[PDB]
Amino acid sequence: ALGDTLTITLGGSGGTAKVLRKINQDGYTSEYYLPETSSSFRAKVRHTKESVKPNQVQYERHNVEFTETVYASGSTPEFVRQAYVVIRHKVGDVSATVSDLGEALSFYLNEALYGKLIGWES
Amino acid sequence: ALGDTLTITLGGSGGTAKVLRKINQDGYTSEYYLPETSSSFRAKVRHTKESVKPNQVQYERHNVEFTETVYASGSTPEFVRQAYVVIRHKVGDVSATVSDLGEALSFYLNEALYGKLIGWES
Amino acid sequence: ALGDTLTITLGGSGGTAKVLRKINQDGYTSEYYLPETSSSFRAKVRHTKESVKPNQVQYERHNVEFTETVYASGSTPEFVRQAYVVIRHKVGDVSATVSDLGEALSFYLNEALYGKLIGWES
Amino acid sequence: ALGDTLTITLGGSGGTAKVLRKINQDGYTSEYYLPETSSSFRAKVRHTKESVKPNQVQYERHNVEFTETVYASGSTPEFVRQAYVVIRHKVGDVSATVSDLGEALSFYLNEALYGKLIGWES
Amino acid sequence: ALGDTLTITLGGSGGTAKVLRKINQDGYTSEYYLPETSSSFRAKVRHTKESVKPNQVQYERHNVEFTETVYASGSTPEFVRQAYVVIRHKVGDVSATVSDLGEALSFYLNEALYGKLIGWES
Amino acid sequence: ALGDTLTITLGGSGGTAKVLRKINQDGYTSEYYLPETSSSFRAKVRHTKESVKPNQVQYERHNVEFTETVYASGSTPEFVRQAYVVIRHKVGDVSATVSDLGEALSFYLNEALYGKLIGWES
Ligand SMILES: [Ca+2]
Ligand SMILES: [Ca+2]
Ligand SMILES: [Ca+2]
Ligand SMILES: [Ca+2]
Ligand SMILES: [Ca+2]
Ligand SMILES: [Ca+2]
Ligand SMILES: [Ca+2]
Ligand SMILES: [Ca+2]
Known part of the structure; x- marks a missing residue:
């Protein structure tokens, strides 16, 4: 029920x-x-x-x-841009805890970071 | 770069x-x-x-x-908590543009949302 | 959307x-x-x-x-009355344009016409 | 005999x-x-x-x-836009009745609706 | 069409x-x-x-x-508590009428009554 | 011990x-x-x-x-209208608690709701 x-x-x-x-x-x-x-x-x-x-x-x-x-577009074929996330935890884990990780990931991943990633930086 | x-x-x-x-x-x-x-x-x-x-x-x-x-620990076997992201774009794509989609995702994914997700809300 | x-x-x-x-x-x-x-x-x-x-x-x-x-009902077996429409366009097509063709069809198909159709008029 | x-x-x-x-x-x-x-x-x-x-x-x-x-057009290949309707009834059904459905469909299908459909709304 | x-x-x-x-x-x-x-x-x-x-x-x-x-919870294993209803009627029946029977059941089944049932009072 | x-x-x-x-x-x-x-x-x-x-x-x-x-009745054959409930719990469970769930169901299931169900609203 995330919404319409x-x-x-x-x-x-x-x-x-x-x-x-x-x-x-x-x-x-x-x-x-x-x-x-x-x-x-x-x-x-x-x-x-x-x-x-x-x-x-x-x-x-x-x-x-x-x-x-x-x-x-004309000669340029159709292409895609895509980003996704996956959260994985044991069944029965403490949701709040799980939520904190990922909450940490979203935080880590910002404009500056994505910039570097696209530049293949590790 | 990306850091040590x-x-x-x-x-x-x-x-x-x-x-x-x-x-x-x-x-x-x-x-x-x-x-x-x-x-x-x-x-x-x-x-x-x-x-x-x-x-x-x-x-x-x-x-x-x-x-x-x-x-x-004890009867509780070892388990894991895991979260990850994937960004995918065509080779010559415009970095800024791509980055903006990842930023949109990080922004979308906050504590509240993660809660709902774990609650199987679609 | 589309309604409940x-x-x-x-x-x-x-x-x-x-x-x-x-x-x-x-x-x-x-x-x-x-x-x-x-x-x-x-x-x-x-x-x-x-x-x-x-x-x-x-x-x-x-x-x-x-x-x-x-x-x-009685000797009369169960039967059906059915009408349907299909719209087909290429993926990136301009919605407005496409919509206009469907509007043209709905407009064309009025009571009078339906009459003729059922009468096998081509 | 729908006309020339x-x-x-x-x-x-x-x-x-x-x-x-x-x-x-x-x-x-x-x-x-x-x-x-x-x-x-x-x-x-x-x-x-x-x-x-x-x-x-x-x-x-x-x-x-x-x-x-x-x-x-140039690099852009040829494509099509298409809309059609199908009315289906038992042989011997009351035409006026049949005509009312479909008459109802044409009515239902308007610019606003087509807009939504193209947007994949259900 | 029930609700979020x-x-x-x-x-x-x-x-x-x-x-x-x-x-x-x-x-x-x-x-x-x-x-x-x-x-x-x-x-x-x-x-x-x-x-x-x-x-x-x-x-x-x-x-x-x-x-x-x-x-x-500790020694106590996991268990459930269920309550469910079933309404059955023929195709074509009068909704209002059928509904009245369900309402009759809901009305009948109150706390006092559930108490008795759980108590095996037949 | 229910009653005449x-x-x-x-x-x-x-x-x-x-x-x-x-x-x-x-x-x-x-x-x-x-x-x-x-x-x-x-x-x-x-x-x-x-x-x-x-x-x-x-x-x-x-x-x-x-x-x-x-x-x-004449052409119309015989048919029924049924409504039934089932309560399920483990032996030893707390009656009061279990009863509360049944009460929740009865309360939930009212005329409006039955209407929807009969209407196949899922
Ligand atoms: Ca937190
Ligand atoms: Ca940006
Ligand atoms: Ca238009
Ligand atoms: Ca000819
Ligand atoms: Ca009419
Ligand atoms: Ca009533
Ligand atoms: Ca109670
Ligand atoms: Ca579905």
Whole structure:
């Protein structure tokens, strides 16, 4: 129940919010979409329970994925831009704790960092 | 660059800083580490360049992954808490633009949201 | 969006409104329903995205279908009355333009025309 | 006997009427066409009697289809825009009743609705 | 078409509200969920159409089910508490009428009565 | 220990009372009945103790079921209208607590809600 729309604010808390509309919801999965003119935006939220095995811990996996599809322009073919996250924890873990990691990741990942990453810096 | 240490600030900004040390770097990858008594933290950075197809756009992937390994204690076996991000764009893409989508995601993913996610809200 | 209810106004504008309720949504599809004693109404919305071919334009299909199911009575077996529309355009196409063609069709299809059609007039 | 021409009024009862010429008529089927410069328009009207089976109701099916073909422009390949309708009823059904549905569909499908559909809303 | 949330008011009217979040909706089936520290609540709604048979009436089933799950606590293993209702009627029946029977049941089943049932008073 | 009669108030509180007569009581099971000119009402109460298994919790089921049976009328064959509830909990659970969940269900299930269910609103 995340809502009927999902807003992607390009460039961070700065601005250029793209409000996507819920387009589908199946198997603990939602999809939002916003067609635009020269590109379209899409967001997916999925939840999964990793395959239980005999003598081992069972994990849950949560995923959020943003995708921008840039339509072909003349000779330039169509391509995509995409970013997503995956949170993974044992079933029964302390959510608050889990939330703190990832909360830490979002914090770590900022404009300056993405810049470096794209530059292949490690 | 990217640094010799990497700080995972649990709970996000103002949270508990865990400063890891770069301990290894192979195959366009980095591994930072910070051992403790009860658990250990590990962060990995990975860069990939999907293969050139005859008639296709060639993409690059950038991945950052935080992992807290909680050592087994008593009856409770060892388990993990993990969160990671993946950025994917075509080769010649405009960095700023791409970065903006990642910034949008980091911005979207806050404590409140993570809560809902763990609660299986789609 | 699109609504939680869907109103089928028999006889067109000013006709008999039949307001159905959304009862299901799976695979980029919606199903609205309104049961009655003698018959039941059902409306389905479907979205499709034809597969990417090596050297071809990729199309999307949008379909809306009204269906009145008249339950069997006496010797008269159960039968149906059904009308539906399909809109098809390439992926990056200009929405306004596309919409205009659908508007042209809705406009073309009025009572008088439907009459002729049923009369096999070509 | 729908006439020698068929007018497609783009954007609805607003304007931009494209008057297509009858181009062929075979097997209870007519085809109109209008070549234009950067695109061409085509309309098809078909009538069918669904395959009779032993112990079941037999249906008739009527179809009207508008198609705009946009010729290739430089690097941009040729593509199409298309919208069509299908009315389906048992043989012997009360035409007026049948006409009311569809009459209801045309009414339902307007600029605002098409907008949403193209946006993949359900 | 039920709603992003579903509230379970323990102890009936004026009791303790537990607002669950819609987690999924698929085969004409909904699922709400609300995880908590010591237990979790889950509600499901299911609609069925019983097996259509030759010379017989066609029935529909409507089910609603509440389930609190108390997580294991020390020696005490995990267990649940369930309460669910089923409404069954033939296709075409008069909703108002059918509804009256369900209302009769809800009305009948109050605290005093549940007490007796749990007490095995037949 | 239920009572010589059981009243089914159609339409819930303030509705039409149908006081049924206890007809039998045997395997921790009761049965009330009230025959009428055009239909008959019948209520049943059943208590069960689920299959006791090795390393598992032992559950008990409590069921109550209302059934109006409308006798065949001319062409219209005979059919029923059912509504029943099931309460399930482990042996030893706290009655008050369990009861609260049933009360929550009864409270939740009102006329408006039944309307939606019959309407297949999931
Ligand atoms: Ca930026
Ligand atoms: Ca669904
Ligand atoms: Ca926190
Ligand atoms: Ca009319
Ligand atoms: Ca227009
Ligand atoms: Ca001919
Ligand atoms: Ca109580
Ligand atoms: Ca009532």
